[PDB]
Design a protein around this nucleic acid. Structure first.
Ligand SMILES: [Mg+2]
Ligand SMILES: [Mg+2]
Ligand SMILES: [Mg+2]
Ligand SMILES: [Mg+2]
Ligand SMILES: [Mg+2]
Ligand SMILES: [Mg+2]
Ligand SMILES: [Mg+2]
Ligand SMILES: [Mg+2]
Lengths: 54, 95, 151, 48, 288
RNA sequence: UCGGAGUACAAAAAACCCUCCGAGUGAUUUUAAUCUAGACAAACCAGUCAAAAUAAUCACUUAUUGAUCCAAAAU
């Protein structure tokens, strides 16, 4: 099929993926009660230490 | 709590708070779950998991704890290697 | 002009001069894998989750720094990511600093050239994800097996 | 009758399991269990 | 300017006679008098509270107190002796050179970072210095000589790419103090002591060209450093050929606190005069 | 102190020196693992389920049990 789009239709080759919806997490609580520590990493934006003013 | 010391006039701290908790800089207080070293064989693997955890304390408990704790444990801390430094800030919190 | 008994000269007498640690041994590393002056290295900086796409591009046929066996065997296993114009496209995503994405891509590259320059690569195939492919291959093979000369 | 606690020892290394044996001894204690270090199924032997 | 000014021509003198503090500045105290706030004065009725004795804070009314049911744990364990390193982002660094607080021209160690008020060190609090992070990694355009107590790979990288030299140097509690607020140490008027060697556990960190440790063998400096470039993919500049070379080269003794001075000395800042010992035992002491 | 029924007729909860039954463990083999979404319940403490990710049954089954600290043990 790769030969087709290059040779035949003068086209670039579309590639696709399968995307399942990002998992559902409840509205974050100011004081998570009785929760595993890792609770915090659930709502983590991305993984990187971010030193705001430092 | 000792709200005024004898010799310094300052506000003392409870030590037995400190030995068993940890304060993040967000204000979240962290603790062990009680009885985790206690009667293991008698317990289901599930429970054992639930116990070996570290957990968070609700607002009431936290405020309480703060009162028994001076400034010095509320200060910001950068430890080399700190397992918990990853955790200290709040992210994406919209209230 | 101070010196103490513990100074860097007195501990390490062999190397002395202030310009000693600043030598650049270009003779030590002569190989220069992946000549970054010949790559088109593009950045997609996405800010919002903060991530910077790092993209590595060069012509497979026009790249001399890899030998012909290595140059042709890379068009084999990696043929999925290759482009209609002959370019080999490498992508990294994760780190918000684009430096670690540079290192990521240059390392996926070093990996590809390392594995393809190993004739000892046997391309081990797992049966867990491909059992469906083998069994559907054979089950379309029983019907492909009908023999009549056509056209 | 009684409830005994016995400490079961792995073949390989310091990995331990901890469990109770019956005082009448209907089935004496040796197990096929999980050892963490080498990620394996082994015979845990009854010990103290 | 402030047309408010021209409103004051109109009005009578500003004097003591007429002064109002900003509304809502004083939130007025009330006193338990009168019909409203007298009579039990918000102390409630009888019981314990009305008599002012209610029990201490951790107390649950005898049910085993919340804070006390929970088992102890290594947490704050040895918290006093765990080293701390005040972070410095590259972004903040670029900032500080940009507004010309710390100038790249002359060498940069902690002291300079301090004087630009770019960083704050409280040595008494177990702060062992400034450490480096990668935040402005891509932002960073400056050619600089930096000496820190700790740094991270990516950071070292981002300075290399621009052609500066980073050295990891250690300071003990005392010497670190002397470092940060040096003028008040001089006004203490005590000699300038020897520098400690890092403790045993720290030794391996400072002996690696990996970190460009100040106690490491310079023979590996050109090696591991060049290595840094192949990993991060850039052309390594030739520092020996540069004009600013002799500043970038500039090092300290492992025994030296400052730049240009030596253990044993004494500074008289009134006479603007340095004093060095001519006695032998002293020189053997402070030069060892 | 813990659990079943009534009191409490249909989501939940619900007292009594109220009515009636039980528990402070047996019996085995198949030794019932790590790790984590989401939940129930709940003043707190404790209690419960649990997908994906890597390699326990039967006795009405529900009850078979105690937190810190402190001691003894080794990994
Ligand atoms: Mg016993
Ligand atoms: Mg009143
Ligand atoms: Mg009264
Ligand atoms: Mg009363
Ligand atoms: Mg500080
Ligand atoms: Mg009913
Ligand atoms: Mg609820
Ligand atoms: Mg499963």
């Amino acid at each position: 099929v790769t030969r087709v789009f290059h040779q035949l239709l003068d086209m670039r080759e579309p590639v696709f993926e399968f995307v399942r919806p990002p998992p559902y997490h409840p509205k974050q609580k100011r004081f998570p009660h009785r929760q595993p520590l890792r609770y915090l990493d659930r709502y983590r934006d991305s993984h990187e230490p971010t030193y705001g003013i430092y | 709590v000792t709200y005024f010391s004898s010799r310094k006039g300052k506000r003392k701290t409870v030590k037995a708070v400190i030995y068993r908790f940890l304060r993040l800089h967000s204000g979240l207080w962290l603790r062990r779950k009680a009885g985790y070293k206690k009667k293991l064989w008698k317990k289901t693997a599930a429970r054992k998991r639930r116990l070996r955890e570290f957990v968070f304390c609700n607002k009431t408990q936290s405020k309480l704890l703060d009162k028994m704790t001076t400034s010095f444990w509320k200060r910001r801390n950068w430890y080399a290697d700190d397992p918990y430094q990853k955790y200290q800030d709040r992210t994406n919190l919209k209230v | 002009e101070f010196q103490s008994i513990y100074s860097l000269d007195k501990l390490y007498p062999e190397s002395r001069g202030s310009d000693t640690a600043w030598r650049l041994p270009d003779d030590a590393k002569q190989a220069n894998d992946i000549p970054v002056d010949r790559l088109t290295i593009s950045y997609c900086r996405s800010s919002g989750k903060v991530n910077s796409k790092a993209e590595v591009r060069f012509h497979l046929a026009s790249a001399d720094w890899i030998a012909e066996p290595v140059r042709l065997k890379l068009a084999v296993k990696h043929k999925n990511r290759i482009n209609r114009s002959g370019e080999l496209i490498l992508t990294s995503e994760c780190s918000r600093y684009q430096f670690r994405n540079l290192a990521d891509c240059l390392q996926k590259l070093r990996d590809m050239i390392a594995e393809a320059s190993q004739p000892x690569x046997x391309x081990x195939x797992x049966x867990x994800x491909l059992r469906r492919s083998r069994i559907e291959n054979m089950n379309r093979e029983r019907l492909r097996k009908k023999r009549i000369s056509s056209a | 009758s009684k409830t005994i606690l016995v400490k079961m020892m792995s073949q390989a290394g310091t990995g331990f399991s901890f469990n109770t044996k019956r005082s009448r001894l209907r089935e004496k204690l040796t197990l096929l269990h999980y050892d963490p270090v080498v990620k394996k199924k082994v015979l845990f032997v009854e010990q103290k | 300017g402030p047309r408010a000014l021209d409103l004051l021509r109109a009005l009578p003198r500003v004097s003591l006679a007429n002064l109002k503090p900003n509304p809502g500045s004083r939130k007025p105290e009330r006193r338990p008098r009168g019909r409203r706030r007298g009579r039990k004065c918000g102390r409630g009725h009888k019981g314990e509270r009305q008599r002012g004795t209610r029990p201490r804070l951790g107390f649950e009314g005898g049910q085993t107190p919340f804070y006390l049911r929970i088992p102890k744990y290594g947490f704050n364990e040895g918290h006093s002796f765990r080293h701390q390193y005040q972070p410095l982002s590259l972004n903040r660094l670029q900032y500080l050179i940009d507004l010309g607080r710390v100038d790249p021209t002359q060498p940069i160690d902690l002291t300079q970072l301090v004087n630009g008020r770019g960083v704050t060190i409280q040595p008494s609090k177990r702060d062992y210095g400034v450490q480096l992070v990668e935040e402005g990694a891509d932002t960073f355009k400056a050619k600089v000589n930096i000496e820190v107590q700790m740094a991270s790979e990516l950071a070292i990288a981002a300075i290399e790419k621009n052609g500066g030299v980073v050295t990891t140097a250690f300071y003990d509690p005392r010497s670190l103090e002397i470092l940060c607020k040096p003028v008040p140490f001089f006004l203490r008027g005590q000699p300038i002591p020897k520098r400690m060697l890092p403790p045993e556990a720290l030794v391996p960190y400072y002996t690696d060209a990996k970190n460009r440790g100040y106690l490491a063998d310079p023979a590996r400096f050109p090696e591991a450093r060049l290595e840094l470039a192949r990993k991060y993919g850039y052309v390594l500049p030739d520092i020996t050929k540069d004009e600013l070379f002799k500043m970038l080269s500039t090092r300290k003794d492992p025994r030296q606190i400052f730049f240009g001075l030596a253990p044993g000395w004494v500074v008289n800042m009134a006479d603007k005069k340095i004093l060095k010992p001519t006695d032998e035992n002293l020189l053997k002491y402070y030069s060892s």
